[PDB]
């Protein structure tokens, strides 16, 4: 049973983890280093000497697709499709295995001794409001079901023992709190946050499994074995046994604070807004604890790399429903969800429009996708050279562009004319069939597969690079 | 005075030229290798062991902007801006700078003529599986018309149809084609002399493809790029001059009325174009260097080498756009948009609705961009040449219905089969600039700027951090 430390050791053995011994400030400096590293496809980073703290800081953990795959016990990135086929069936789901004691409760501090300032929480960007916890697995139960939800919600530092809990309103945690409030007026909402759990639990948390299902159960499937957990000290929630740090506490009903501004995955600052305050009553950690952090900003960043790997998970679920779809890609440059390229084997006139509507309606994660480009299967959706080629040789813009007004949009997307409402554009860049055009359509250049394969065979020997 | 070999030596010194010793077929295989190489921004390629031939094959010469620049003796591409300014003034008497003619030249070391002419000995490439025949793609065709002395150079694709016969595919507005057409009117039934040089010095090659007016010899323009007169030699069987350092020269003529079906061939649009008739070039002489090298390329689904060339040569028009629209910081036509069909323009926006004026400017100001179907306008914090910035801008600064402009019934290239009617179609502009008050009622996002002190500090310890190692 591999905890996070075992994963770091595996990475180090493979030249995928660098230990930095120079002094580096968690205030801005770590982010700059991680950003350059991620942008060059470099390793994960363990800062052994954060200025002013004793606890090392781990970041860029999932900065490459490879390391995301490795984190689910797979060799490489195309095994994620198989995990998609699995995620299909969940639309006896294995419980947690509760241990009696756990490394994450080796050192405990509570009440007045709680001081989040001892932790090397990072400040990512110059106009961010305060240090920000970015890799916390927040654990919650609602009043109506037993399911334990895990989500990653950014958490601003506002005191020795107070964090702001920034869950957006459709999240498991947020819905649990909302229901708790209705069902138990004025009663404190217990919550716990785990930092540095095992990679399967972390990845399970971020995968959009249905609200009905504990993210712990999914992590179990990725791992091959039940998720090892421990009961929290001050509530009935369970956290991963191997976690490096655990924060336990509650939300006082009605207590809120102005959150931000903070730089986002879109590359802009979010403006101030109100979210609940999480009061921390306990902090439990391992001996020699490691603090796991990250940053979001202009893409690409670690979340976006995560999000490309998790798109591979969705391809099979889309293909079950639309078997005409050969590939489906959300470029990290499009802020991970705002633009999709879809390639199909077109079977009839107007086919592309059915596929656009399918992307905009079938799965909720794509409901806010503003641009959808549809192409034939002779295009590689992951290469702008092919996609722009297809756009500029197979479209008449007015004929082949679909615009739909007054559709749901992310309320933080400031480019829509009104908060929560905007338009969508689909580009039909498929070959046009009789009926769709009265011209003689061009015959595209296809490569000889025998020549392709032969050159694959001698590629390394040719040694051009 | 640098010939082509001197250039290949310079490139090799700088890690910009790879010699391939493995056997590779000019039928399809070279193209595959060159295509992968170009798509990865790799070096130029010299195939020393082409299957079935002894003459090495050079391609991907200009597969990178850098190598285009190096080909004109520069670090970077912006000397082409100065040419743009020059060509503007005319609509400088020592731009009538002639050729320097040698008597005897390396390109006439070995000579074959009449029945000994056999183009099949040359490793002419076949680029794509349904191409009709091997195709000569980097020939500088040289012609004179009957009325002026000016020698035109153009690159016209040339299909192999016999031991000594090529098809000459000049489109009808080309210098060569106009010369032939005039020759026909002025001398009915007389043979039209023509010559084709392969592997001239880079300035001559680049000069051939610069769009200079029909009134001027492309040799004069190569002279300006080089800093010195172009070295040439008289052909053996006619009065045309070819570059002295050329690796191979084909001399001959066009018999009036002799034509052949040309193609189909894959073109820069990525499609096959259909068969059509063009004149036949009869080859009476082939002259070459000792140890001659054959210079080739391919065109296809972009990007390809011609498209990278075409990007570098668009720098010739940027200053003319900027004289008129000084708000324009950059103006880029991606190769992967068939070189002219998509433009990315970055501006310093000065008022609400500015992007629309710029779109209309692109679609109206010069004939070079009138047929551009898509135009994306962005702010100057975007690098127009990086799809990571441009997509970021599109997806964070647009509402599609508000910010997309469509105009119907506008002029479109007759060969573009995607428009509903030949010659007529629509255009789209994407206004991906930051929206000002009036354009939006929302509080627009403040972009994330880095702390320059932190950036500089990390620059200072970067090597010591040793992240790579
Ligand atoms: C991996 C990750 C994810 C998330 C986040 C972050 C990371 C690293 C951080 C904290 C760095 C950045 C923000 S941000 O991308 O919104 O700017 N963050 C985040 C947020 N979801 C959310 O509601 N608030 C958040 O604050 N998300 C997404 C969220 O955690 C994810 O959608 C979960 O699957 C939601 O789980 P459920 O609530 O559906 O169970
Ligand atoms: C650089 C280059 C250029 C050209 C070409 C090719 C290359 C490599 C090849 C041979 C690869 C392929 C075709 S293609 O781009 O049309 O697909 N070729 C070409 C053709 N111009 C032309 O009339 N026929 C041609 O066959 N062009 C364009 C032409 O040479 C260019 O427009 C010149 O500036 C014309 O000079 P003028 O006749 O105006 O003096
Ligand atoms: Mn959930
Ligand atoms: Mn000319
Ligand atoms: Na979750
Ligand atoms: Na020319």
UniProtKB/Swiss-Prot annotation, chain A:
NCBIfam families assigned to the protein according to its UniProt record, in alphabetical order: PRK10922.1, UbiD family decarboxylase
The EC number(s) this enzyme carries: 4.1.1.98
Binding site for prenylated FMN: 152-154, 166-168, 171-172
Cofactor: record remark: Binds 1 prenylated FMN per subunit.
Keywords: Cell membrane, Decarboxylase, Flavoprotein, FMN, Lyase, Manganese, Membrane, Metal-binding, Ubiquinone biosynthesis
Main EC class the enzyme belongs to: lyase
This protein's record includes keyword tRNA-binding: no
Catalysed transformations (reactions): a 4-hydroxy-3-(all-trans-polyprenyl)benzoate + H(+) = a 2-(all-trans-polyprenyl)phenol + CO2
GO cellular component terms, A-Z: cytosol; plasma membrane
The protein, known as: 3-octaprenyl-4-hydroxybenzoate carboxy-lyase
Membrane topology listed for this record: Peripheral membrane protein
Subunit: Homohexamer.
Pathway as given in its UniProt record: Cofactor biosynthesis; ubiquinone biosynthesis
Family: Belongs to the UbiD family.
Cofactor: prenylated FMN; Mn(2+)
Biological function: Catalyzes the decarboxylation of 3-octaprenyl-4-hydroxy benzoate to 2-octaprenylphenol, an intermediate step in ubiquinone biosynthesis.
Primary location class: membrane
């Amino acid at each position: 049973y591999n905890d996070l430390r075992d994963f770091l050791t595996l990475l180090e053995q493979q030249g995928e983890l660098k230990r930095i011994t120079l002094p580096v400030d968690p205030h801005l400096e770590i982010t700059e280093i991680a950003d350059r590293t991620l942008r060059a496809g470099g390793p994960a980073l363990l800062f052994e000497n954060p200025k002013g703290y004793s606890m090392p800081v781990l970041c860029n953990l999932f900065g490459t697709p490879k390391r995301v795959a490795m984190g689910m016990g797979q060799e490489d990135v195309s095994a994620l499709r198989e995990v998609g086929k699995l995620l299909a069936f969940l639309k006896l789901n294995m419980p947690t295995k509760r241990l009696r004691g756990a490394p994450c409760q080796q050192k405990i501090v509570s009440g007045d001794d709680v001081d989040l300032n001892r932790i090397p929480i990072m400040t990512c960007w110059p106009e961010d409001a305060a240090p920000l916890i970015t890799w916390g697995l927040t654990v919650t139960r609602g009043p109506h079901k037993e399911r334990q939800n895990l989500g990653i919600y950014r958490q601003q530092l506002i005191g020795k023992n107070k964090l702001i809990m920034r869950w957006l309103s459709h999240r498991g945690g947020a819905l649990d709190y909302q229901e708790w409030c209705a069902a138990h007026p004025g009663e404190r909402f217990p919550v716990s946050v785990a930092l540095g759990a095992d990679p399967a639990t972390i990845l399970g948390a971020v995968t959009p499994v249905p609200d009905t299902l504990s993210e712990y159960a999914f992590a179990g499937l990725l791992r091959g074995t039940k998720t090892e957990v421990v009961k929290c000290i001050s509530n009935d929630l369970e956290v991963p046994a191997s976690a490096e740090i655990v924060l336990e506490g509650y939300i006082e009903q009605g207590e809120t604070a102005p959150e931000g501004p903070y730089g986002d995955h879109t590359g802009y600052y979010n403006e101030v807004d109100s979210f609940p305050v999480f009061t921390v009553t306990h902090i439990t950690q391992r001996e020699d604890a490691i603090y796991h952090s990250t940053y979001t900003g202009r893409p690409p960043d670690e979340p976006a790399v995560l999000g490309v790997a998790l798109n591979e998970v969705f391809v099979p679920i889309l293909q079950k429903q639309f078997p005409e779809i050969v590939d489906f890609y959300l470029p990290p440059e499009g802020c991970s969800y705002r633009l999709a390229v879809v390639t199909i084997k077109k079977q009839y006139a107007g086919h592309a429009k059915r596929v656009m509507m399918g992307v905009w309606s079938f799965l909720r994660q794509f409901m806010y996708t503003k641009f959808v480009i549809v192409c034939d299967d002779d295009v590689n959706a992951r290469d702008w050279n092919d996609v722009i080629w297809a756009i500029t040789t197979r479209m008449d813009p007015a004929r082949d562009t679909v615009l739909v007004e007054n559709t749901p949009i992310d309320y933080l997307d400031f480019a829509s004319p009104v908060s929560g409402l905007g338009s969508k554009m689909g580009l039909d860049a498929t070959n046009k069939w009789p009926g769709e055009t009265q011209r003689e359509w061009g015959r595209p250049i296809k490569k000889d597969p025998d020549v392709v394969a032969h050159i694959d065979a001698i590629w390394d020997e040719l040694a051009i690079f």
